[PDB]
Design a protein around this ligand. Structure first.
Ligand SMILES: CC(C)CN(C[C@@H](O)[C@H](Cc1ccccc1)NC(=O)O[C@H]1CO[C@H]2OCC[C@H]21)S(=O)(=O)c1ccc(N)cc1
Lengths: 99, 99
């Protein structure tokens, strides 16, 4: 898939048997989701964006399937206004910017 | 060029005779810069991200040169922690996501 940017680059993601939509976000270091429940241990972290910071649960080694391609890595869970797929996962699905 | 995402997608931008580095950011609807000072009229706006909202000055029809390609459009100026090139400019330089 090559995709243009006239609209938000939203993709369907499958995580822990749940289906969510998330933004492919080259400006995000890490993947952050709001509306999900991951089982198991986690560590507290704070991440910062434009309006300041949020507290997140950091879950490690989480399987995600993004537009039908698999990746494992860190997923942050917290009060983000929009689910975002960050570079830590984008690299695993072979995602690049082109111009 | 094509750009992989192992590192932040930082590019050099020339705006109003000033040189800045900015993140090519597919998760951002609009361009937001901190360390600059554009002349002329503007309108107040608030934009929200992770952490909440910031107050910005909205400047219209601003020329930016991003990695040596020109674009004209809206630039927001405000207390963003990182300069970001958003989709409204990314489309003008023919930027796409590929995987
Ligand atoms: C500002 C960047 C350096 C980092 N942000 C990623 C960025 O893409 C966010 C991602 C984003 C997207 C929507 C809502 C919140 C955050 N976009 C954003 O703040 O865009 C704002 C400017 O244009 C407006 O249009 C979209 C939101 C506004 S971030 O959300 O704060 C962020 C920070 C750290 C991680 N791990 C993940 C995300």
């Amino acid at each position: 898939p090559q995709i243009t940017l006239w609209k938000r680059p939203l993709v369907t993601v499958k995580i822990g048997g749940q289906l969510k939509e998330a933004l492919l976000d080259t400006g995000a270091d890490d993947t952050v989701l709001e509306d999900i429940n991951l089982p198991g241990k986690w560590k507290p972290k704070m991440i910062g964006g434009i309006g300041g910071f949020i507290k997140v649960r950091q879950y490690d080694q989480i399987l995600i399937e993004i537009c039908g391609k698999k990746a494992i890595g860190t997923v942050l869970v917290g009060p983000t206004p929009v689910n975002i797929i960050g570079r830590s996962m984008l690299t695993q699905i072979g995602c690049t910017l082109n111009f």
